[PDB]
């Protein structure tokens, strides 16, 4: 199937018609997405099969065909772009200054942009175009809006 680097939609035909359950990144022959999008299940790319290789429910990440390849990190100062791929809609870059998730184990970048649940797995990029994490796991604040963490894996 298609292995060209880029952003991809994750679809299913189990429910009514064709539904977009999430988004992912293809880089160096490995497909990267959020665990809640696929639940670790196998994926189809045309006539080819993508088998899970690594995953972790707590980090909410999963890689297919090989180990996690994305290792860029937000610098803590600069603006970033969410390359949002919403269901049924064209890919669109949105620039924003990330906030912070403060935890008992350290701080994490956060992006306060509102998108449907099927946009989960959309990549967040730095000015060099490097993927600093995926959008889709966060919290609902007082005003009803969604604030997602910049979720990044570890490159072994």
């Amino acid at each position: 199937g298609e292995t060209t680097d880029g952003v991809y939609r994750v679809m299913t035909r189990r429910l009514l018609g064709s539904t977009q359950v999430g988004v992912g990144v293809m880089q160096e022959g490995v497909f990267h997405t959020m665990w809640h999008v696929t639940k670790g299940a196998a994926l189809r790319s045309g006539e080819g099969r993508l088998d899970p290789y690594w995953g972790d429910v707590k980090q909410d990440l999963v890689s297919y065909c090989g180990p996690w390849k994305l290792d860029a990190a937000w610098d803590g100062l600069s603006e970033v772009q969410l390359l949002a791929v919403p269901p049924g809609e064209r890919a669109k870059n949105i620039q924003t200054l990330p906030g912070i998730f403060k935890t008992k184990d350290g701080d994490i970048g956060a992006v306060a942009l509102d998108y449907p649940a099927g946009t989960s797995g959309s990549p967040i990029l730095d000015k060099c175009g490097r993927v600093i994490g995926l959008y889709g796991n966060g919290v609902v604040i007082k005003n009803g809006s969604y604030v997602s963490a910049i979720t990044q894996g570890k490159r072994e």
Partner: protein
């Protein structure tokens, strides 16, 4: 059966729509991977 479809290149776009605030929030992460607000 889940399947994938290409949606675009991963590149920074000059003069893209700039929006979104930068909130500083105290959060907790549980063993199930769910974030919650700590107050």
């Amino acid at each position: 059966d889940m399947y994938i479809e290409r949606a675009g290149d991963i590149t920074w776009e000059k003069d893209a729509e700039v929006t979104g605030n930068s909130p500083r929030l105290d959060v907790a992460l549980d063993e199930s991977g769910d974030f919650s607000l700590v107050e």
